[PDB]
Subunit: 334 residues, 4 copies
Amino acid sequence: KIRIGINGFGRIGRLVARVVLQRDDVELVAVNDPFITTEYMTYMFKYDSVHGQWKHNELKIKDEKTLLFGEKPVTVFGIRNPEDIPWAEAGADYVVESTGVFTDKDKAAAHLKGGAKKVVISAPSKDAPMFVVGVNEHEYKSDLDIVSNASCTTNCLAPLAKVINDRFGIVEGLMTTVHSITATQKTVDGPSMKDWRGGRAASFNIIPSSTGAAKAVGKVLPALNGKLTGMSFRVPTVDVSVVDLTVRLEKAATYDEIKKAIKEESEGKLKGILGYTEDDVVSTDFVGDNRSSIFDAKAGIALSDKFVKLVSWYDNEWGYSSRVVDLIVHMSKA
Amino acid sequence: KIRIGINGFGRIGRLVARVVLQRDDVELVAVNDPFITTEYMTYMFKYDSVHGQWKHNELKIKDEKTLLFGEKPVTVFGIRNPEDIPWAEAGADYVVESTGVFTDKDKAAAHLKGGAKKVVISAPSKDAPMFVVGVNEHEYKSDLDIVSNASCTTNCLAPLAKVINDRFGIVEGLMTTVHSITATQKTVDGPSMKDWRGGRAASFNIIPSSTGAAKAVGKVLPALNGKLTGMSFRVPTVDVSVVDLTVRLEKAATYDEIKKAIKEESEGKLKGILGYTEDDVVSTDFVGDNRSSIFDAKAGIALSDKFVKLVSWYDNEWGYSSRVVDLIVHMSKA
Amino acid sequence: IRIGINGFGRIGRLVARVVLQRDDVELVAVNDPFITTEYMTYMFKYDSVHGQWKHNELKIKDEKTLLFGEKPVTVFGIRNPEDIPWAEAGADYVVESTGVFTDKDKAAAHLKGGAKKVVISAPSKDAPMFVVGVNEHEYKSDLDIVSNASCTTNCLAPLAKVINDRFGIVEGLMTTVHSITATQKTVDGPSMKDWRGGRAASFNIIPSSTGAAKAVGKVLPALNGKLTGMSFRVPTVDVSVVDLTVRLEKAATYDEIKKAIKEESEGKLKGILGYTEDDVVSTDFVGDNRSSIFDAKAGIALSDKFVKLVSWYDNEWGYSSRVVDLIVHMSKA
Amino acid sequence: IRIGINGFGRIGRLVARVVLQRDDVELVAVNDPFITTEYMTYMFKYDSVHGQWKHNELKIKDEKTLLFGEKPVTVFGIRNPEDIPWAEAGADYVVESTGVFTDKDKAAAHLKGGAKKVVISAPSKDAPMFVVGVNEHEYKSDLDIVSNASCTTNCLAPLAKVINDRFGIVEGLMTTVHSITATQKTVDGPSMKDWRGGRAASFNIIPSSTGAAKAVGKVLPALNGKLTGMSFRVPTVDVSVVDLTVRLEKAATYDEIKKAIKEESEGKLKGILGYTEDDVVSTDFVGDNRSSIFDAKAGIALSDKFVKLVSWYDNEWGYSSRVVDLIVHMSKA
Ligand SMILES: NC(=O)c1ccc[n+]([C@@H]2O[C@H](COP(=O)([O-])OP(=O)(O)OC[C@H]3O[C@@H](n4cnc5c(N)ncnc54)[C@H](O)[C@@H]3O)[C@@H](O)[C@H]2O)c1
Ligand SMILES: NC(=O)c1ccc[n+]([C@@H]2O[C@H](COP(=O)([O-])OP(=O)(O)OC[C@H]3O[C@@H](n4cnc5c(N)ncnc54)[C@H](O)[C@@H]3O)[C@@H](O)[C@H]2O)c1
Ligand SMILES: NC(=O)c1ccc[n+]([C@@H]2O[C@H](COP(=O)([O-])OP(=O)(O)OC[C@H]3O[C@@H](n4cnc5c(N)ncnc54)[C@H](O)[C@@H]3O)[C@@H](O)[C@H]2O)c1
Ligand SMILES: NC(=O)c1ccc[n+]([C@@H]2O[C@H](COP(=O)([O-])OP(=O)(O)OC[C@H]3O[C@@H](n4cnc5c(N)ncnc54)[C@H](O)[C@@H]3O)[C@@H](O)[C@H]2O)c1
Ligand SMILES: *SC[C@H](NC(=O)CC[C@@H](N)C(=O)O)C(=O)NCC(=O)O
Ligand SMILES: *SC[C@H](NC(=O)CC[C@@H](N)C(=O)O)C(=O)NCC(=O)O
Ligand SMILES: *SC[C@H](NC(=O)CC[C@@H](N)C(=O)O)C(=O)NCC(=O)O
Ligand SMILES: *SC[C@H](NC(=O)CC[C@@H](N)C(=O)O)C(=O)NCC(=O)O
């Protein structure tokens, strides 16, 4: 039923491929990467430095056109531009924009001319519609040709911000995210003309960089629009990131009260999306965590009973790619 | 004139030794480390994985009692407990408490029975007097038997917090410090019974841990006492750390205004202690920076003109050990 | 078979993972004076390399027992060994994983704890050495106390045995590129026993020591004095590789060497010596429970008598799997 | 002597540091299409390994010149080489540091730029290869375009020359434990030319390729076909080590080998081959400008004809020092 093809077998592309491969509501029809060879795709999928080897399927058949995942056959495209890929000729309703270069509303629209019914954008986009599963996936409508699943950081922030606002209200908030390094960085000092500090050696530097993660938590949560901002800090970890959010509350609460409220919501409307822990966890403890956001109770601290600092964890790779397929199923139905 | 002996040839002990070795107002009389051998001390001093090889002096003479720094002779003690070291019998007025185990007011008092006129504690202490050069070293008085130079994080926060408060006033602030790993951490998962997350592998984890850095910025800046708190994040860097401070201001300002005020103070009463940069700097750019705190203009962001997030850098090893000898000279004179 | 672990370190905890998941064996007690029994729950549960645990073990009583499912495991905080009452909770086989008691007589303290047999989680100067799959068969059940050698020995010895057994090695020099361990330092600090071992582990290529190459002969008397080597510690959490440089008595071609190692991979050395022709990397062997895996594509030969062979081992996982494989071989008389 | 650099990368910028601080040479122009001339100021000024610069170089005019003190350096953003007017700002000697133009004919594009001589910041398939201190003397001033070989070659060849020159090496196998470079990846990504090179560089021991061992013979025809080897990339910013395994024609003892290398250290190989008996570590060679330094204490011999020798090199700094050492040797006819 839900036939899928992925555009760009990157970090997110391969990992959301793993997610859809071990589910029964979802299927994998095609993959497009002009840079990866069909024999190379098997190696890239099988071996992972973060999430480990794959326990099910894996094999390539045809000279250079079809791979065998188990006995499900997946189609491979090495096509540079998006409209030139015949997304229908292998059945692909939902295309994952996992490439990172075609982010914008019009730029993902390129897939519909390949014969694709809908496309979901990995990254946030300047104009394409933005949804964070569990906080506003419900304002999706089926006229929508093209969609965006926002960012890892948005997906961790917005569920956590929403319960705080929805039971105590946020007046103003400032966020930092200390974030693992990604494919856009460099091993050693090199050119990254659009972010100068992004060119510096990723694994041996604490890199200040920017993410819009916060104001977007209003572009999808319009109640909090223009109420938050932040920055980032890229630091030498392969995967897993944490959000440090500092907000003042209109309605006074105690740290135990906000803790108990987050536990409440963790087992309610937000179960499996926003989690709760009171353990002495660290970075590694969330590799493979398929939740958008988990709440580090012990980490955070309160100054007033209206001014508090909240800590929450997210696997920027795994949990986010779980969320993209969670979104695709919601639009299937709705 | 200013004769010095250091207790504990650790990271800070050796580095403040380098600082005093290349100054003319200061001298090096003795070093005590029960764990380091006088031949081993030369190796540990000469070769440094962070700050590099040493350009001046270095040689050991006596079988196992005296080292030759240039032609200045330094005395070496391998004594377990503090009062059992004859601090006078080599002329030592000022003893650096660089050990980390004798932090408390009474526990550093142990050096005076060795015949030492004054002792300065590297770390912050529960009761010993606390001074951050450039913000309250002047409230030092010469009755003081024993003193503490506070923490790296305090030394970066308090100068930066003081100009913000002193020209706009801080109502409430929450701070995070993303901090390099230190000697108290473990290479791989091991026992650290007093901080559980501190036992996790330092170089491959983002470790939430606590530092009191903020409320102390009142124990030495009583105008801001009980007005700030924070947490830490230990991440896989050898050296250099940054403070992310989030405060609301009673008196409204614009980001350019606060930038210009920090530049003003950078060249005034705080010159050489609190610095100013508008460059796309990264972690490595402050190794060997001898300032307590440098202000990252471009990094930070403002939400309101009364609610702002400020970013400032500090070399937790080098700048802090520069500050300990800066403090010792102030107490020499005062 | 009842097993108790001394020192819930890296090797101790991971040997606990092994024995808790296999069914021919069970875990009776653990002793660590530096860890509190609740702290063992946290440290066992959470692992930066091998991940969270997918079964369950919890605390029952204030300081004395944990329950994995519903089985005891009594917890000791005893500083020195002859004071550990391995009989009083009935622990027949003891893992000496502390690293401080390598010597035969110093680990003998467990027999006075009322423990019938002792396995050293390390090489020892004066304890019989066995590398499962190459000499585990020379154990005798009179021998009270023993050593399973080192990770590096357990990786080298199968490969050395196969290479010598089919072509004969004249002389060998070995290098291992090795992950950092608990004995290294976060930052430059005192390590008087290894001066380069005190240097910041994660920012350095640190030259270090290994006995493993000399050790091969102590369990493979055919090559005694025919190998020696060195180590290089590098900033990785886990997984290490052996770089072996050998002169061959019998000339062979690299592809022939590949098929010989493949043969033994598939045959009696299965699960001890593996074989791959993949573009493997260190990460690809986290959780690999083999003693040694052979990186075919990596290695190179200069002549048909002079060749360099590359092989992988997870210093944590594979060695601990070998530890309880050895213990069960010793059960079987 | 006027020098211009093509590609302000790691090697390009650091060769710029060298030529800007020495006085027998000067720096005339730089070309990089991916860097804007203000961006060169930022990237040259700030370095994660070698630190900030202690002199000064700034921008003068919108895109065309920088001033180090008050000397020009004109800046080019030209994609392909024959379009770089090395004559029009008068740059006689060109550093080809881009890494894409190794081939003799492809770097010949600078002679059409009006440049009299070209030095390849790398090995090349079809360009004469020189390792300063071992064969720099065979340059002829008719040869228009050239290569300085690789960091690994420049470290191995002095040590191989000394060892062979006094004891003769029969066969050699080499390993290098090497820092990561710009060609590796932050996270697992496409590198179809080296499949293991795309894997996350900083979390892996990555087996990789080297021609340096075969290359030694191309500049040391005595040992042609007597050495070969492999590499291991490990998560460090800079500094690498060679692990050399040799068979000796003339039997020697390790201490004798130590004093022979010490002799050459002190003598004609001074500043190219260094010698230490210290507990050195990788960090200790950041900024070390020698081709090769000999870690005496590290290495080990099996017999007096079979020995393993360890030597250090800063792949960035020492190689770039060698680059302009070569250029000035070529000035001198
Ligand atoms: N990496 C993360 O943790 C993460 C998390 C959430 C969202 N995102 C977003 O997802 C997008 C991709 O992220 P990533 O980390 O996977 O980057 P990546 O580099 O790992 O993936 C990019 C992949 O796309 C392929 N590709 C490049 N050009 C292509 C094209 N023209 N057509 C088809 N494929 C092409 C490349 O081969 C590469 O495999 C980015 O926009 C990023 O912001 C990333
Ligand atoms: N490391 C930093 O960046 C930093 C910065 C500011 C303040 N501090 C504080 O300074 C203190 C030391 O810090 P560090 O990083 O140098 O730790 P460290 O481990 O590097 O130094 C401790 C040194 O003290 C020696 N020592 C141990 N016991 C001793 C004793 N009984 N008598 C004499 N010497 C003994 C050890 O040999 C070791 O060399 C700590 O309290 C720390 O909080 C550290
Ligand atoms: N780490 C490896 O990759 C590896 C692999 C194979 C073998 N080994 C060997 O195993 C031994 C332990 O290695 P590790 O990495 O687990 O070290 P580790 O530091 O992680 O473990 C040592 C543990 O023993 C405990 N301990 C100390 N004294 C004790 C006492 N007297 N009684 C009970 N417990 C005590 C400590 O609390 C610590 O938890 C070493 O000899 C090492 O050489 C290590
Ligand atoms: N990195 C090392 O430790 C090292 C050491 C010795 C030799 N080398 C060799 O030197 C060469 C470069 O190495 P690197 O580490 O500096 O790589 P790098 O990526 O740091 O440098 C390449 C630079 O060349 C520039 N460039 C690309 N195309 C260009 C063009 N056509 N014209 C002008 N500039 C262009 C790029 O912008 C980049 O800045 C490689 O061949 C490498 O093998 C590297
Ligand atoms: S993980 C989601 C991802 N965002 C980022 O990695 C940017 C993170 C930023 N704050 C930083 O530098 O740390 C994403 O969805 N991509 C959007 C983008 O930045 O292009
Ligand atoms: S660098 C000054 C040092 N403080 C710390 O390293 C603790 C930092 C903490 N926030 C963290 O875990 O990141 C110091 O002066 N020592 C005091 C101490 O913590 O003992
Ligand atoms: S990992 C097994 C361990 N041996 C080592 O620590 C040596 C690692 C070697 N390759 C190196 O130096 O890097 C062990 O069982 N303990 C050995 C011992 O000290 O008894
Ligand atoms: S560092 C010099 C560089 N050579 C290498 O990249 C090889 C490094 C080797 N030890 C390894 O693989 O790790 C170079 O000058 N370029 C070589 C080339 O491709 O031409």
